[PDB]
Structure formats: C-alpha cells, structure tokens
A paper describes a structure:
Native crystals of SiaA-PP2C were obtained in conditions A11 (0.03 M MgCl2, 0.03 M CaCl2, 0.1 M tris, 0.1 M BICINE, 20% v/v glycerol, 10% w/v PEG 40000, pH 8.5) from Morpheus (Molecular Dimensions) with space group of P212121 and diffracted to a resolution of 2.1 Å. The SiaA-PP2C domain is arranged as a tight dimer in the crystal asymmetric unit. The SiaA-PP2C monomer adopts the canonical α-β-β-α fold first described for the human PPM1A and subsequently found in several other phosphatases. The core structure of the SiaA-PP2C monomer is a β-sandwich composed of two antiparallel β-sheets each comprising five β-strands. The two monomers interact extensively with each other through residues projecting from helices α1, α2 and α3, forming a compact homodimer that buries a total solvent accessible area of 1392 Å2. Consistently, in size-exclusion chromatography, instead of monomer (~33 kDa), SiaA-PP2C eluted as a 66 kDa dimer, suggesting SiaA exists mainly as dimer in solution. The two Mg2+ ions labelled as M1 and M2 directly involved in the catalytic mechanism are coordinated by oxygen atoms from three evolutionary conserved aspartate residues and occupy equivalent positions in SiaA-PP2C compared to the two Mn2+ ions found in the Rv1364C active site. Compared to Rv1364C, which only has two bound metal ions, a third Mg2+ ion (M3) was found in SiaA-PP2C coordinated by D600 and with an incomplete octahedral coordination shell. We note that near the entrance of the active site, a hydrophobic pocket lined with residues I554, V564, L603, F619 and A620 constitutes a potential site for the design of inhibitors. Another distinct feature of SiaA-PP2C is a flexible loop located between β7 and β8, whereas a Flap subdomain, which has been reported to aid in substrate specificity, is present at the equivalent position in human PPM1A and many other PP2C-type phosphatases.
With our study, we demonstrated that the protein phosphatase SiaA and its kinase counterpart SiaB target the protein SiaC at threonine 68 (T68) and provide evidence that the SiaABC proteins make use of a partner switch mechanism to balance cellular aggregation in response to carbon availability. A partner switch system (PSS) typically involves a PP2C phosphatase (SiaA), an anti-sigma factor with kinase activity (SiaB) and anti-sigma factor antagonist representing the target for phosphorylation (SiaC).
Residue numbers in the entry:
A (entry chain B): 409 to 521, 528 to 576, 580 to 663
B (entry chain A): 407 to 520, 529 to 577, 582 to 663
Write the structure that this text describes.
Amino acid sequence: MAAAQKKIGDSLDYASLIQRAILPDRQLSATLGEHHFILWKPRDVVGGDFYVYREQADGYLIGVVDCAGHGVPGALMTMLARAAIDHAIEAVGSRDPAAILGETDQAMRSMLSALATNMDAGLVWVDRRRRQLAFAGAKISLYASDGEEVQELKGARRAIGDGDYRNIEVPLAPGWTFYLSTDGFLDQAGGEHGFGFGSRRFADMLRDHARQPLPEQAEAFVATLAEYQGEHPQRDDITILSFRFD
Amino acid sequence: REMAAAQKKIGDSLDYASLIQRAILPDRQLSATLGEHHFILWKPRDVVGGDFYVYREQADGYLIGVVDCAGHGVPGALMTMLARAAIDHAIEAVGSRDPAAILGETDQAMRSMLLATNMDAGLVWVDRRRRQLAFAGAKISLYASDGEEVQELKGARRAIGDKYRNIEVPLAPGWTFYLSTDGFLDQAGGEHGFGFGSRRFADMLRDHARQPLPEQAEAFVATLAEYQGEHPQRDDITILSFRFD
Ligand SMILES: [Mg+2]
Ligand SMILES: [Mg+2]
Ligand SMILES: [Mg+2]
Ligand SMILES: [Mg+2]
Ligand SMILES: [Mg+2]
Ligand SMILES: [Mg+2]
C-alpha cells in the first residue's frame, strides 16, 4: 500500500516550507534584482544544500553551502548550519569569509556532539565601495567570467568539520559575472555515456552565457542540464548562486 | 512493478536523521554531571520528532529544560535544529540563570531565522549555591513531588510565538522535579481512549517520587504502556526529571 508514501510526501512538502523560510530569496530580489540569479533544486523535497546572503551599505556577503547528505539528514544539517552562519556573521562581521567559515566550523562542533557532519561552503564578501572581492571556500570554488575569460578561485581541499581558512582577494572589475555552485550540477550524470556534467562543460557554459542578463543565464543553465540529463535521475541537490558587478 | 525500495530508502534516511537529532541532545553531559539525580524519557512519535531537551552545567548550578516545537516527524525535527541553536544564542546573550529572559531571547532568535512555528518550553535554573530554583514556561509546567504532595508551577497558557516571568522556589530535600511535554499527558488510552491527563500524571509522580530516578523512569514507561494498550503513540514524548538532596 502507497498510503504511507502519501503521508511521508505531505510531511516532506510541509518540511520544504520550513527549509524555504531559511533562504534569503526576498532580500536577494529586493537588493540585487537582476544582478543575481538562484538555481536551487533539492534531489528530494528537502536537501542538504542552501545559500546565504547579507546586504551591507558598502557591499554584501553571499554564499552556498552543501551539508553532509541530502534528503531529511541533509535538511537537518542545513538548519544547524544556517544558525551557525548567523552566529559567525554576528561574532566576526560579514566582511571576512575565512573568519566566518572558522567560526561556523566552531559553532557546528559546539552543537553536534559514526556521523558524517562535514560541509562544503563558498563564501564571498563583495566590497562594492573598495571595488574588491574576498572569497574563502571549503571544497567550493568561485567561478568568474566576463564572457571571454573564465577564472576559478579554488576553495580548500578540506570540508568544514574534520582546517585553517584564508581569503583570496581579487580586484572587482565591471562586466564580470560570478558563480557559486555546489558539486550537484557538476556531478549530474547524463549525455551519451552517463558521465557527470563536469568542470570543463561547466566553465564553457559560464563563458558562453556570462555577458547575458542573469534571468536569461538561469533559464539557459536549467535547460542545458535538463537536456544533458535526459532520462537520468537527479544525482544530488543542485544550487547555483550567481551575482554580477556593474 | 511495486517500487517498494523507495520505502526502504526513506526509512534508512530517517534512521540516519535520528542520529543527527540525538547528537544535539545533552545526554552525555547530563550523565556525567547529574548521574542518577536525573532521568530522561525521550520517545519521538516517528523516528524523529519535534521534542528536545536542554541542559547547561555551571559552577554554581545548572540550566535544564524541555521544548516541544510545532509539529512532529520531519517538520518538527527541523524546528528542533533551529530551536537548539536559538537556545544557545539566548544562553550566550542573557546567561543560563534567567529562564524567562532565555525564553524571550529564544522567541526573537526564532523570528529572525524564520507556517506553524510556535513552541512550548519549560526552563529551570537550579541554583546550588542559593539552594533555590527559577522556573519559566510557555505551555509547560514544572511538577515537584516528595511522595506525599504534588506541586505544579504552571507555565503561561501561551506558546513561544504568540504575545515571560520567573517563578522562584526553595529547594527542600526529598523532592523530585519533572519537566514533561504534553505528549505523555496527551497519550490516548484506557477505558474511553481519553488522554492520560494531568490528574493521572500527578498521581503517578506522587506514587513514584521516592524511588531512585532510574526506577521512576521504568515505572513511568510501564504506566503509559499499560494505559495505552493497543492505541498508537499520539505525540512525541519527553520527560526530564532531576532531584536535589
Ligand atoms: Mg549534501
Ligand atoms: Mg563534492
Ligand atoms: Mg552535493
Ligand atoms: Mg511538536
Ligand atoms: Mg499541546
Ligand atoms: Mg507535544
């Protein structure tokens, strides 16, 4: 009998309302408008992926997080990590991504006493006033493109909760689109042999669309994966948070 | 054609999600500091629930409490992660000695992060140095018994998320204290499928209040199992008990 399957589905659908409530959608739309786009597709109804955003007068903090697991266990991690990120932003400010990650790690260790509790994160402080960007990541990269060149600011090879973090500071040039993605989109199986999309198809896709309006890029990226994937099930939670300077 | 493998996947996922929820519980700290001066009864309705409990040891005393978040199952379990972190923030912002201030601050921390979102909580600051207690609750009571009388320090009839004060009380020797969510008192059973209730609960506490707390815990489980019979578990159950002298 599939009556139990209906019960769980209704329970998870309501749990997705809780997980959506912790996402900064409204704030992103109201402050960045079309100078951002969000792609957020959990594998199940609730996932282990989420994203953060904190607007300041002089710039903004923006990031993506992939907590251990997907489904319900991943979604539980997402609640803890969202609160751990808020604590960290309050303890060290929103301008130092490496300090935020260090403090997030500590806050997580403080709440969780064999359990996979590690998490990937890519955090960026966009300092509009001083025209420079600070990035710090644990197994998450910052991709940047002007439609000609594709740069990848690689994150540390260590996940949060196992590592000391450092910021990568780049000049902030106009005409550049930035992309923060979890592994899910790049790991999506598909195509002729069932290989994951990968870093090379991803960098090419970004360069190809980087100069385009971000609402158009978002649509093209969704249609590019839908096409690639075909009949293959979604392998992992997908998140792409994009933002553009001038 | 019956894709039953999905039901296995979800079951294994929930069982692993219960390891995450158990990791946020202060079991180890409670056992290491209170030993047999405490007992915990924690039984979610499903694999994961909306109920949890807190504990924070200080040099001069301890903070102990129970929380019942909106819902049960997975949605309830998501609320517990948020509330656990909101309680940590509140303890850091106002200290672990003012239960009413902790509840106020927990409410604010919850409103900043987030739909039924209200929650019940009963928080107690046990002062060892002043030989007193401070209690504040939102739809949760503090029960006390010496095996003869039963005292109930009632919490506000409003939940955290609607509209808090401390009730200070002296610690007399031979008294056992009990913090329970509504789940045990709402358990359907008996002759007419009625919930256990406050009067059967007070009598149960009085009947066992003189026993070692590991024995009380067992008697409480056997009392509900008997009452419940064939009735399914109606809600998440939590009983956190503590004793001084
Ligand atoms: Mg994950
Ligand atoms: Mg990975
Ligand atoms: Mg992933
Ligand atoms: Mg509940
Ligand atoms: Mg109730
Ligand atoms: Mg309840």
